[PDB]
Every structure is written in C-alpha cells, then in structure tokens.
Design a protein around this motif. Sequence first.
Motif, PDB file in Angstrom:
ATOM      1  N   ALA A  20     -24.668  10.262 -29.148  1.00  0.00           N
ATOM      2  CA  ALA A  20     -24.549  10.229 -27.700  1.00  0.00           C
ATOM      3  C   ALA A  20     -24.366  11.655 -27.176  1.00  0.00           C
ATOM      4  CB  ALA A  20     -23.392   9.310 -27.304  1.00  0.00           C
ATOM      5  N   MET A  21     -24.260  11.759 -25.859  1.00  0.00           N
ATOM      6  CA  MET A  21     -24.082  13.051 -25.222  1.00  0.00           C
ATOM      7  C   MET A  21     -23.168  13.953 -26.054  1.00  0.00           C
ATOM      8  SD  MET A  21     -23.752  13.344 -21.169  1.00  0.00           S
ATOM      9  CE  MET A  21     -24.010  11.766 -20.375  1.00  0.00           C
ATOM     10  N   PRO A  22     -23.322  15.287 -25.837  1.00  0.00           N
ATOM     11  CA  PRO A  22     -22.520  16.260 -26.559  1.00  0.00           C
ATOM     12  C   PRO A  22     -21.090  16.302 -26.016  1.00  0.00           C
ATOM     13  CG  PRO A  22     -24.187  17.388 -25.203  1.00  0.00           C
ATOM     14  CD  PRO A  22     -24.260  15.901 -24.902  1.00  0.00           C
ATOM     15  N   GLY A  23     -20.174  15.767 -26.810  1.00  0.00           N
ATOM     16  CA  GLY A  23     -18.774  15.736 -26.423  1.00  0.00           C
ATOM     17  C   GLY A  23     -17.889  16.331 -27.521  1.00  0.00           C
ATOM     18  N   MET A  24     -18.136  15.883 -28.744  1.00  0.00           N
ATOM     19  CA  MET A  24     -17.372  16.359 -29.884  1.00  0.00           C
ATOM     20  C   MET A  24     -18.188  17.354 -30.712  1.00  0.00           C
ATOM     21  SD  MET A  24     -14.378  15.590 -31.468  1.00  0.00           S
ATOM     22  CE  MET A  24     -13.611  16.633 -30.240  1.00  0.00           C
ATOM     23  N   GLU A  25     -18.464  18.497 -30.101  1.00  0.00           N
ATOM     24  CA  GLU A  25     -19.230  19.537 -30.768  1.00  0.00           C
ATOM     25  C   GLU A  25     -20.396  18.920 -31.544  1.00  0.00           C
ATOM     26  OE1 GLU A  25     -16.507  22.621 -32.300  1.00  0.00           O
ATOM     27  OE2 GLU A  25     -18.330  23.375 -33.372  1.00  0.00           O
ATOM     28  N   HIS A  26     -21.163  18.097 -30.843  1.00  0.00           N
ATOM     29  CA  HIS A  26     -22.307  17.439 -31.453  1.00  0.00           C
ATOM     30  C   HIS A  26     -21.893  16.830 -32.794  1.00  0.00           C
ATOM     31  CE1 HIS A  26     -22.553  21.847 -32.310  1.00  0.00           C
ATOM     32  NE2 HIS A  26     -22.691  21.374 -33.581  1.00  0.00           N
ATOM     33  N   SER A  27     -21.408  15.598 -32.722  1.00  0.00           N
ATOM     34  CA  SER A  27     -20.975  14.895 -33.918  1.00  0.00           C
ATOM     35  C   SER A  27     -21.724  13.566 -34.043  1.00  0.00           C
ATOM     36  CB  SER A  27     -19.465  14.653 -33.900  1.00  0.00           C
ATOM     37  OG  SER A  27     -18.761  15.617 -34.676  1.00  0.00           O
ATOM     38  N   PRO A  28     -22.837  13.604 -34.825  1.00  0.00           N
ATOM     39  CA  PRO A  28     -23.646  12.415 -35.032  1.00  0.00           C
ATOM     40  C   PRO A  28     -22.960  11.447 -35.997  1.00  0.00           C
ATOM     41  CG  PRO A  28     -24.707  14.340 -36.060  1.00  0.00           C
ATOM     42  CD  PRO A  28     -23.352  14.776 -35.528  1.00  0.00           C
ATOM     43  N   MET A  29     -23.376  10.192 -35.921  1.00  0.00           N
ATOM     44  CA  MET A  29     -22.812   9.163 -36.778  1.00  0.00           C
ATOM     45  C   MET A  29     -23.852   8.087 -37.102  1.00  0.00           C
ATOM     46  SD  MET A  29     -19.208   9.459 -35.227  1.00  0.00           S
ATOM     47  CE  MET A  29     -17.656   9.614 -36.096  1.00  0.00           C
ATOM     48  N   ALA A  30     -23.954   7.776 -38.386  1.00  0.00           N
ATOM     49  CA  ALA A  30     -24.900   6.772 -38.839  1.00  0.00           C
ATOM     50  C   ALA A  30     -24.452   5.394 -38.347  1.00  0.00           C
ATOM     51  CB  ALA A  30     -25.020   6.835 -40.364  1.00  0.00           C
ATOM     52  N   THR A  64     -40.989  14.367 -42.662  1.00  0.00           N
ATOM     53  CA  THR A  64     -39.802  13.945 -41.936  1.00  0.00           C
ATOM     54  C   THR A  64     -40.105  13.830 -40.440  1.00  0.00           C
ATOM     55  OG1 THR A  64     -39.153  16.175 -41.753  1.00  0.00           O
ATOM     56  CG2 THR A  64     -38.517  15.170 -43.757  1.00  0.00           C
ATOM     57  N   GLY A  65     -39.430  12.885 -39.803  1.00  0.00           N
ATOM     58  CA  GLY A  65     -39.615  12.663 -38.380  1.00  0.00           C
ATOM     59  C   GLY A  65     -38.397  11.965 -37.771  1.00  0.00           C
ATOM     60  N   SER A  66     -38.204  12.200 -36.480  1.00  0.00           N
ATOM     61  CA  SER A  66     -37.086  11.603 -35.770  1.00  0.00           C
ATOM     62  C   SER A  66     -37.555  11.063 -34.418  1.00  0.00           C
ATOM     63  CB  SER A  66     -35.954  12.614 -35.575  1.00  0.00           C
ATOM     64  OG  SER A  66     -36.194  13.827 -36.282  1.00  0.00           O
ATOM     65  N   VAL A  67     -36.968   9.940 -34.030  1.00  0.00           N
ATOM     66  CA  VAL A  67     -37.315   9.312 -32.765  1.00  0.00           C
ATOM     67  C   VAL A  67     -36.043   9.099 -31.942  1.00  0.00           C
ATOM     68  CG1 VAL A  67     -38.288   7.235 -31.719  1.00  0.00           C
ATOM     69  CG2 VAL A  67     -39.429   8.302 -33.699  1.00  0.00           C
ATOM     70  N   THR A  68     -35.826  10.007 -31.002  1.00  0.00           N
ATOM     71  CA  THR A  68     -34.657   9.929 -30.143  1.00  0.00           C
ATOM     72  C   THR A  68     -34.929   9.007 -28.952  1.00  0.00           C
ATOM     73  OG1 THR A  68     -32.924  11.239 -29.294  1.00  0.00           O
ATOM     74  CG2 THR A  68     -35.032  11.829 -28.492  1.00  0.00           C
ATOM     75  N   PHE A  69     -33.882   8.315 -28.530  1.00  0.00           N
ATOM     76  CA  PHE A  69     -33.994   7.399 -27.408  1.00  0.00           C
ATOM     77  C   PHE A  69     -32.636   7.190 -26.733  1.00  0.00           C
ATOM     78  CE2 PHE A  69     -32.531   4.608 -30.908  1.00  0.00           C
ATOM     79  CZ  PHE A  69     -31.524   3.944 -30.280  1.00  0.00           C
ATOM     80  N   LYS A  70     -32.688   6.970 -25.427  1.00  0.00           N
ATOM     81  CA  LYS A  70     -31.476   6.755 -24.656  1.00  0.00           C
ATOM     82  C   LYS A  70     -31.313   5.260 -24.376  1.00  0.00           C
ATOM     83  CE  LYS A  70     -30.480   9.659 -21.455  1.00  0.00           C
ATOM     84  NZ  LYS A  70     -30.500  10.665 -20.369  1.00  0.00           N
ATOM     85  N   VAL A  71     -30.099   4.890 -23.998  1.00  0.00           N
ATOM     86  CA  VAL A  71     -29.799   3.499 -23.698  1.00  0.00           C
ATOM     87  C   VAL A  71     -28.904   3.431 -22.460  1.00  0.00           C
ATOM     88  CG1 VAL A  71     -28.817   1.367 -24.619  1.00  0.00           C
ATOM     89  CG2 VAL A  71     -30.113   2.914 -26.131  1.00  0.00           C
ATOM     90  N   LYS A  72     -29.404   2.741 -21.445  1.00  0.00           N
ATOM     91  CA  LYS A  72     -28.663   2.591 -20.204  1.00  0.00           C
ATOM     92  C   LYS A  72     -28.441   1.103 -19.924  1.00  0.00           C
ATOM     93  CE  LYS A  72     -28.355   6.640 -19.306  1.00  0.00           C
ATOM     94  NZ  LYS A  72     -27.124   5.834 -19.459  1.00  0.00           N
TER      95      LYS A  72
END
Length: 102
Positions: free
Chosen positions: A42-52, A94-102
Amino acid sequence: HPKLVSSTPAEGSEGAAPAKIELHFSENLVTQFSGAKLVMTAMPGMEHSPMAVKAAVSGGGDPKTMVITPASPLTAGTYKVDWRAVSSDTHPITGSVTFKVK
Ligand SMILES: [Cu+2]
C-alpha cells in the motif's frame, strides 16, 4: 523489456480488487523458477514495507495457463503481483503487475 505473452493479472488495475489473476504463455513449461507472488505494498508509510499475501497459484484448463487466486479478499490500497516466467534457456523472465484497490 521482456514480458510474458499475454496475461490478465491486474495491469495497473486501479479502482478495485479483481477476482483472480490470469496468465498465458505460448511456452510456459515452468520446471525452473517460474511462479507468482502477490505483495501488499500500500501507499508509502513505513519506509516502503511490502508484505506477501496469503494467495495461491493454480493453472487453468491448460498447463500453459496460470491463474492466481488469493485465499483472502484484496482490500483497498496498493498491491504488486510479481510473476516469473521461464521456458528453458537460463535467465528467467521477471515481471510485476501493480494494481490499486478502492
Ligand atoms: Cu525467449
């Protein structure tokens, strides 16, 4: 530059979470290091901390067809679906597919 043939994961899918990620390849045949993994960054809040996320990868009717189905519902925010396709010739794609959710 290099990307799988065709897929329907969530190419910059902003607005809401999809049902399931789709993937297609004229020459999938993993048996190397191909797969997929969804991470909730999600948005950058915790110094960009991704989670699986708790998701699973399952192919459709054909083995050359991938279908990512998360066991949990994707909530609003931002996520990145990293996928990896490899036929047979070292150097995996390798590839990545980013998407938002509202
Ligand atoms: Cu190639």
